[PDB]
């Protein structure tokens, strides 16, 4: 299928004492594979998936150097953003950066992205074409003009369409046994007698990967949205994901209702029915 590599950076200023917190995590699809945390002891990019441990010392040295360099750019950003917004040095603020690339089921480049936020709001992002910037406000516009002058977009576009894609493919090959494995949901339905006259049917999807899934209820073959609840997809903690969807039904009428499960690991959608 389609695949992605993404990095997520979070930098939070510590006005009380010392340097900002900086945490970087890297993902291939829904699998975290590296982390760097400024507060940790190693001061190294660390592995978080077994297949990345295939890489040797030059890789780890190189990733550590780059991620520490990015962390210093973010440290300078916090200061600069405080000035832009005329903010006091007393308060903590947050910067986030997310970037990466998608390839299609043929592993060709599809799309790249680089976005940057300040205090939880859009600040500046590359547009879909990777050739220009969107700036949310006049502070971000100042940045935009700076980065236009530096011709940042051109170097970033080269990374996203080039390096990012090549290394994604490398990882997908090296981690093939899990990264290219689809884990269809293990599904079952439970039944919770809610009162004398109503029952709740809960359709579970467990231990799936990747995280994308659709759970839908129908009654008599049509979509049921009334009296349903659908929880946010959540990590199991072993690398797989969980979700459920529930509907409240009149007791005795459970058979009209069907839960429909769509997932990349399923040859065709599953249908579950309480009988």
């Amino acid at each position: 299928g389609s695949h992605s590599m993404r990095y997520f950076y979070t930098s939070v200023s510590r006005p009380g004492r010392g340097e900002p917190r900086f945490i970087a995590v890297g993902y291939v699809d829904d699998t975290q594979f590296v982390r760097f945390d400024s507060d940790a002891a190693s001061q190294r990019m660390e592995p978080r998936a077994p297949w990345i441990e295939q890489e040797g010392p030059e890789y780890w040295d190189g990733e550590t150097r780059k991620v520490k360099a990015h962390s210093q750019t973010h440290r300078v950003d916090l200061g600069t953003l405080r000035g832009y917004y005329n903010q006091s040095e007393a308060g903590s603020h947050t910067v986030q950066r997310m970037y990466g690339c998608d390839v299609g089921s043929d592993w060709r480049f599809l799309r790249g992205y680089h976005q940057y936020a300040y205090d939880g709001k859009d600040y500046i992002a590359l547009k879909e074409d990777l050739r220009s910037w969107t700036a949310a406000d006049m502070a971000a516009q100042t940045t935009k003009h700076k980065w236009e002058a530096a011709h940042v977009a051109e170097q970033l576009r080269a990374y996203l369409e080039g390096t990012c894609v090549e290394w994604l493919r490398r990882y997908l090959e090296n981690g093939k046994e899990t990264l290219q494995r689809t884990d269809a949901p293990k599904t079952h339905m439970t039944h919770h007698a809610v009162s004398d006259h109503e029952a709740t049917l809960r359709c579970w999807a467990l231990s799936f990967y990747p995280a994308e899934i659709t759970l839908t209820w129908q009654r008599d073959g049509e979509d049921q949205t009334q009296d349903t609840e659908l929880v946010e997809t959540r990590p199991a903690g072993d690398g797989t994901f969980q979700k459920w969807a529930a509907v409240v039904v009149p007791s005795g009428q459970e058979q009209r209702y069907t839960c429909h499960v769509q997932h990349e690991g399923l040859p065709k959608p599953l249908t579950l029915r309480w009988e």
Binding site: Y59, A69, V152
Partner: peptide
């Protein structure tokens, strides 16, 4: 694999 240190500050 990270991009090199070409991100400028804002």
């Amino acid at each position: 694999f990270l991009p090199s240190d070409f991100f400028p500050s804002v």
